[PDB]
Amino acid sequence: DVSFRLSGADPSSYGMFIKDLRNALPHTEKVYNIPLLLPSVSGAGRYLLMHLFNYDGNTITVAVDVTNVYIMGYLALTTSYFFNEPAADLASQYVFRSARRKITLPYSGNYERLQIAAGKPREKIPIGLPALDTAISTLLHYDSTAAAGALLVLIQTTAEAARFKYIEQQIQERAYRDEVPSSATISLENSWSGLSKQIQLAQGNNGVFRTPTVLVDSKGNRVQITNVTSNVVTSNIQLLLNTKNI
Ligand SMILES: *[C@@H]1O[C@H](CO)[C@@H](O[C@@H]2O[C@H](CO)[C@@H](O)[C@H](O)[C@H]2NC(C)=O)[C@H](O)[C@H]1NC(C)=O
Numbered sequence: 001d002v003s004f005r006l007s008g009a010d011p012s013s014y015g016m017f018i019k020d021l022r023n024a025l026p027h028t029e030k031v032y033n034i035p036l037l038l039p040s041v042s043g044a045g046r047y048l049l050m051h052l053f054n055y056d057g058n059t060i061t062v063a064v065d066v067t068n069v070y071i072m073g074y075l076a077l078t079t080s081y082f083f084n085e086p087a088a089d090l091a092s093q094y095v096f097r098s099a100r101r102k103i104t105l106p107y108s109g110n111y112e113r114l115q116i117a118a119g120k121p122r123e124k125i126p127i128g129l130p131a132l133d134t135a136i137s138t139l140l141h142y143d144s145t146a147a148a149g150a151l152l153v154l155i156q157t158t159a160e161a162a163r164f165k166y167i168e169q170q171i172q173e174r175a176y177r178d179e180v181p182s183s184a185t186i187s188l189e190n191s192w193s194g195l196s197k198q199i200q201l202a203q204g205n206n207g208v209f210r211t212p213t214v215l216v217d218s219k220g221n222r223v224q225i226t227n228v229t230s231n232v233v234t235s236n237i238q239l240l241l242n243t244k245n246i
């Protein structure tokens, strides 16, 4: 398991947590020096448990699929909560077995569905450590509409920051003040699969992408990534989704 406490939290301990999280994902191989996540894992070993404590010490335990860093559900005191999707029900056979009650949320866990349930796109939802603390508190008391917004924050602070160094840095900047995500942050979140695939395909091709990836950068300018020599590839992306899942 991995842990993170918001009480006394600063940019450095947050950094330690994301490092712990990356190290907890198993991998057998590296492509261009980037851990390549596994095709699959059987049984309970497929799930990593994250324990998060809000400022006041209350806690929730979150289950993550180690093959794709997707959040499947969480435990709050004695009630477990799972997304409404096949992979999450599969996950319920292996974690939080001692939960007294199991609730299935009225949505699946993809951004499209979470944004509809929340009533706002994530372009309009502030993120940061203070926002993570509020999210943990919101999740302790069941409300499907408020939970959708809390999950959008939780996902970006923990799964997305693990996938990209830039997003991890964006969160460290928001350690004491929340701020909506930049356009580059959203573009990055949307291209993880695309990037992961082109980096894997670039191998037998001199490091050149079969088809270019279109992103929006920090200063706000559109851009094309065509080879593994680019910044995104050399210092941004930290984990690769296996092609057998794309
Ligand atoms: C690899 O990506 C780099 C950008 O990261 C590209 O290099 C550019 O390539 C040509 C000349 O090599 C120029 O027209 C571009 O403006 C270069 N940009 C730079 C140096 O910032 C290029 O797309 C890729 N390299 C190869 C060999 O395909």
Ligand SMILES: Nc1nc2[nH]cnc2c(=O)[nH]1
Pocket (backbone or CB within 6 Å): 068, 069, 070, 071, 072, 109, 110, 111, 155, 159, 160
């Ligand atoms: N549930 C979950 N959903 C996502 N939707 C987009 N990315 C993620 C993730 O990392 N976990």
